[PDB]
Design a protein around this ligand. Structure first.
Ligand SMILES: Cc1cc2nc3c(=O)[nH]c(=O)nc-3n(C[C@H](O)[C@H](O)[C@H](O)COP(=O)(O)OP(=O)(O)OC[C@H]3O[C@@H](n4cnc5c(N)ncnc54)[C@H](O)[C@@H]3O)c2cc1C
Ligand SMILES: Cc1cc2nc3c(=O)[nH]c(=O)nc-3n(C[C@H](O)[C@H](O)[C@H](O)COP(=O)(O)OP(=O)(O)OC[C@H]3O[C@@H](n4cnc5c(N)ncnc54)[C@H](O)[C@@H]3O)c2cc1C
Ligand SMILES: Cc1cc2nc3c(=O)[nH]c(=O)nc-3n(C[C@H](O)[C@H](O)[C@H](O)COP(=O)(O)OP(=O)(O)OC[C@H]3O[C@@H](n4cnc5c(N)ncnc54)[C@H](O)[C@@H]3O)c2cc1C
Ligand SMILES: Cc1cc2nc3c(=O)[nH]c(=O)nc-3n(C[C@H](O)[C@H](O)[C@H](O)COP(=O)(O)OP(=O)(O)OC[C@H]3O[C@@H](n4cnc5c(N)ncnc54)[C@H](O)[C@@H]3O)c2cc1C
Ligand SMILES: O=C1CCN([C@H]2C[C@H](O)[C@@H](COP(=O)(O)O)O2)C(=O)N1
Ligand SMILES: O=C1CCN([C@H]2C[C@H](O)[C@@H](COP(=O)(O)O)O2)C(=O)N1
Ligand SMILES: O=C1CCN([C@H]2C[C@H](O)[C@@H](COP(=O)(O)O)O2)C(=O)N1
Ligand SMILES: O=C1CCN([C@H]2C[C@H](O)[C@@H](COP(=O)(O)O)O2)C(=O)N1
Lengths: 213, 213, 213, 213
């Protein structure tokens, strides 16, 4: 199974997939039966905005990402999500700490290594407060409110190729936050491997972003 | 592949499926790893309305049905469709003719065999007019407007198990038109075979209709 | 209330509306408080694909259209529909008969007036068969299957400005069937009147079709 | 405009509304024209699960809530959202601090007043770190990752009465976190005021929760 490491502790993993490039061809033609013409049809559909045939290609991913990344990701309503709960489980001590390279191009009056240090210090104090509240009998759903947005979470994501292409237009792009761009690059890599003709036609005719290819 | 004959000339065929009962278990727990407890969890989810885990189970069907059946079916917006076009193709001489048994329980002043005959006569005249218009150079998208609602159509339908359960609540039920009930019974049969635990839990705790089991 | 006649017997009527251009501005800024900058923001959102603020503008239309037009229209899943039922009511003798001008640009071996005549003759025979079945005790849901696709239907349509813009890209365009193009032109007229800044920005930066303006 | 205070610093405000109880009646009947029978029809629709007519009633709310509440709320995909951004704006020093009464029924080995104190102390240190990072030139989208989940956010929410009833079934209920229950009680109050017949029929026949009425 295709698994890609993202950020310092995150990942994107392909759990399951239904269909391939030919599923979009079989659905568009409403074919009974189970190539230059099939590839030409994918390019035609892509070129002219006939995107419904790509809805018959479905992916299930397992993602580990910080909450501030998941908040942006979960705004994609045309998909399915199941995520770890802070109400029902004790949350793990796992936080996204930016690399000093994250601040490249930014003049800071604090050294980038000291930025890294200050982020680590506050997440350690917040996690210590969280544990002290839990261990004192405070319910989990209340104790977790002191935890910061760089806490890692995990979720299952089921999405079809049309909504995935919308996600790549918006997230595999320089306007999107750098951290979610890194997840979108991995999603694109998996999409390219499972659906080469759809992905190549998407980049050529319909992809709106500025980082892919 | 599971294929079921419906009405006089229709069918329901399973084209593809992603996941099974355990997909709903793996998504709900956000499991890394790939049974009495798993079956108990499905029943708990079903019993308490936690339906999002069943969205990770996805089906693709190939359906041949009359247009009046497809019009009701296509009202289910939480799914994907690709259908044959009367604008782009010459439509086939294939119509749904009710069996004389379709009128059981109805007192008619015309014999049920003569009802069958009158339906056949008008669809033959309409199809003859359609062909005369086509053969005279009338564009297909205009010529087909004389064709009746019992004309057979075909489509690909991609739907997840949660939306499929909503479809079974509404269509595998005595309030739904008898013709779509027959398609819903076949969809239920395929759903039961691919997801036995989800289907049994659905019938026991969440199914709202009055014909299944 | 804005009402527009379409085809020979159809119409588009605006029933209700929530919001205006400023609703998209108030939502995008998450404003507490209730113009060159506001118009500039609409153009920026439109230009860069930030379409979610336009979802806060909602319309309700009352449409009378032939079934073959409604079948294309009802494929727009991101909206709400309520339509007249052939199961529950006796259907009216009202059919779309194309004007002889509908065949302009098509060489026909039958005069365009005789095309009009042949369409009228078959819909009259089909409606007569429908009435004979109803009057003989055949249930309505079965009797109506002989009725042709140019039968008029009516529905309520609730749709937000973002999904409406998607509908205008696809239906107010030469690739769409001429009959639904005529309904989309009327929808565009109503949209322009209620949301002038959004409509002008849509035409300038995001509209994909080839007939508007 | 109906505005309700929630928690220590939050609120729910009705911004706009389209339609009323009669909109669900006018849509269900597809009425041209603009009461015991109308109220009976609402109860019938509610009783038998014919929920699509209530989609023609649409609300726009302005909500101020902590992020952990907004994360649960934003899982309701059949709606529209526009929220304040931590990427684009400097975030305000406003946090949800639970009242000592929030821990009623829980035996804690730390006094409930000291729980309140420990939550305030860590959010003050996190906000101070956030400001130090911002003032040192760290981009906002990175600096805000140290901020905790009880930070207040604000958003516009456009939702129709059917999706709102689903939200009330799940959130105006004892299984939902107490904090979002308080927002759902205010949403219910606004819904009852604008749609009295729909709300009363909802409570009697379709409401699944255990706190309303
Ligand atoms: C760079 C960037 C900046 C952003 N800034 C902000 C911000 O400051 N604040 C904020 O709140 N959000 C912000 N967002 C989030 C953004 O508004 C979207 O919520 C997100 O990008 C998901 O896009 P989507 O709606 O197209 O996707 P999905 O929700 O998956 O929808 C897919 C498609 O379905 C259709 N659709 C789905 N539901 C509806 C509906 N109810 N009505 C109409 N059409 C619908 C649309 O065609 C849509 O493109 C930002 C996003 C990006 C990429
Ligand atoms: C016996 C029967 C009689 C009917 N009679 C009529 C009739 O006379 N006229 C008529 O027009 N229709 C009629 N219908 C169709 C009916 O109104 C629905 O369109 C159809 O049953 C699909 O149901 P659904 O909306 O739940 O499914 P889907 O469209 O697949 O939606 C699935 C679920 O998603 C949610 N949902 C999806 N989109 C929205 C949205 N925009 N807003 C809110 N929630 C949403 C709801 O929770 C819904 O249950 C009838 C249906 C039946 C079964
Ligand atoms: C000229 C023309 C020819 C056509 N020919 C055919 C044909 O031969 N056969 C046929 O079956 N259809 C055909 N269609 C219909 C077409 O495939 C669409 O169903 C219709 O145009 C509605 O478009 P939509 O999906 O974008 O709109 P909506 O259903 O309203 O969706 C709005 C947006 O929401 C998003 N969205 C909604 N639901 C989903 C989902 N489940 N997955 C992913 N994204 C989603 C997409 O971003 C979409 O653009 C044709 C349409 C046109 C205009
Ligand atoms: C007490 C409680 C505990 C929860 N625990 C968790 C948890 O631990 N982890 C977690 O991730 N979530 C959890 N949730 C969130 C939950 O899974 C839902 O995401 C949330 O309640 C929204 O419900 P909804 O899907 O019905 O609403 P919406 O997303 O608004 O959908 C409305 C309706 O539309 C239909 N629908 C919409 N989109 C689809 C689709 N793609 N496929 C099928 N049907 C669709 C369904 O009929 C649905 O009821 C919890 C919720 C509650 C209330
Ligand atoms: O690039 C972006 C910015 C904003 N958002 C959404 C996610 C949240 O719902 C909200 C604020 O996100 P915040 O800017 O604090 O990361 O807007 C988003 O999805 N992508
Ligand atoms: O049982 C039903 C009845 C009505 N409808 C929808 C389908 C159409 O959009 C419309 C009329 O369908 P008609 O009653 O003529 O079969 O209502 C439906 O989906 N199921
Ligand atoms: O221009 C078009 C063509 C096809 N369709 C949809 C509507 C139906 O679901 C199906 C066939 O429509 P038919 O071509 O017979 O009008 O495809 C559509 O929505 N617009
Ligand atoms: O009552 C609940 C619990 C869980 N969730 C969703 C929201 C998040 O996407 C995720 C975890 O929420 P967390 O339990 O940490 O509040 O599940 C939800 O919507 N309602």
């Amino acid at each position: 199974h295709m698994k890609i490491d993202i950020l310092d502790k995150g990942f994107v993993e392909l759990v399951d997939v239904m269909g391939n490039d030919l599923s979009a061809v079989r659905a568009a033609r409403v074919s009974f039966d189970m190539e230059e013409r099939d590839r030409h049809l994918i390019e035609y559909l892509m070129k002219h905005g006939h995107e419904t045939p790509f809805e018959h290609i479905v992916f299930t991913f397992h993602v580990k990402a910080p909450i501030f990344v998941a908040r942006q990701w979960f705004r994609h309503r045309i998909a399915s999500y199941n995520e770890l709960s802070g109400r029902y489980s004790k949350l793990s001590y796992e936080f996204y700490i930016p690399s000093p390279e994250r601040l490249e191009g930014y003049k800071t009056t604090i050294p980038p290594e000291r930025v890294t240090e200050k982020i680590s210090e506050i997440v350690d104090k917040a996690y210590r407060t969280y544990l002290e509240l839990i261990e004192s009998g405070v319910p989990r759903e209340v104790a977790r409110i002191v935890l910061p947005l760089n806490l890692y979470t995990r979720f299952f994501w089921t999405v079809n190729a049309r909504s995935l292409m919308n996600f790549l237009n918006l997230r595999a792009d320089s306007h999107a936050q750098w951290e979610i761009q890194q997840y979108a690059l991995a999603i694109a890599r998996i999409f390219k491997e499972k659906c080469p003709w759809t992905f190549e036609a998407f980049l050529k005719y319909a992809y709106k972003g500025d980082i892919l290819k």
